Amino acid sequence: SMQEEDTFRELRIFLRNVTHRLAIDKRFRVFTKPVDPDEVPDYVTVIKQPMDLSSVISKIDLHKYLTVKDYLRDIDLICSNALEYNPDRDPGDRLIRHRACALRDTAYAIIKEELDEDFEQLCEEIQESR
Ligand SMILES: CC(=O)c1nc(NC(=O)[C@H]2CNCCN2)sc1-c1ccc(C(=O)N2CCOCC2)cc1
């Protein structure tokens, strides 16, 4: 309905604002764009489902997220992918892992403080009705 599309537009505005705040954080610069194949050709090999904050923005604008749960699944994928690609005890690996967990924790904390649970419930009930 027209009212339901108003609800999803509000969700998109909220998700763009959260993603923008993550993308401007210097800690998260490594997650802002897709991995360049000419710089790292072996990334495409190990990581089967690449995700980054620019691609999240693209999916918001393509209306792919109907709930905050669907959005947080892609945030979680950014984090899990980084841990997968960086399993060594080496400090370069440990730094990326720390930043990836901070990205995940920051997104969840913003959502916990700023998303009304009733708004998310409405989004989920509209989604389940389709
Ligand atoms: C994103 C990610 O997970 C990742 N992990 C790395 N791991 C290392 O550098 C470790 C690997 N294990 C050995 C020590 N170094 S490097 C790395 C990584 C860092 C930068 C890019 C990159 O080209 N861009 C392009 C635009 O800006 C955003 C990121 C891709 C992968």
Swiss-Prot record:
Ranges of residues in domain Bromo: 3-114
Physiological role: May be a transcriptional coactivator of the nuclear receptor ESR1 required to induce the expression of a subset of estradiol target genes, such as CCND1, MYC and E2F1. May play a role in the recruitment or occupancy of CREBBP at some ESR1 target gene promoters. May be required for histone hyperacetylation. Involved in the estrogen-induced cell proliferation and cell cycle progression of breast cancer cells.
Protein source organism = Homo sapiens
* Coiled-coil parts of chain: 108-130
Location(s), subcellular? Nucleus
Tissue expression:
Highly expressed in estrogen receptor positive breast tumors and in osteosarcoma tumors.
The Swiss-Prot or TrEMBL record describes its family as follows: Belongs to the AAA ATPase family.
SUBUNIT field? Interacts with ESR1 and NCOA3 and these interactions are enhanced by estradiol. Interacts with acetylated lysine residues on histone H1.4, H2A, H2B and H3 (in vitro).
Tell me the superkingdom of the source: Eukaryota
Its induction, per UniProt?
Up-regulated in breast, uterus, colon, ovary, and stomach tumors. Induced in breast cancer cells overexpressing NCOA3 or treated with estrogen. Down-regulated in 5-fluorouracil-resistant derivatives of the colon cancer cell line HCT 116.
Give the signal peptide range. Answer: none
Record-given protein name? ATPase family AAA domain-containing protein 2
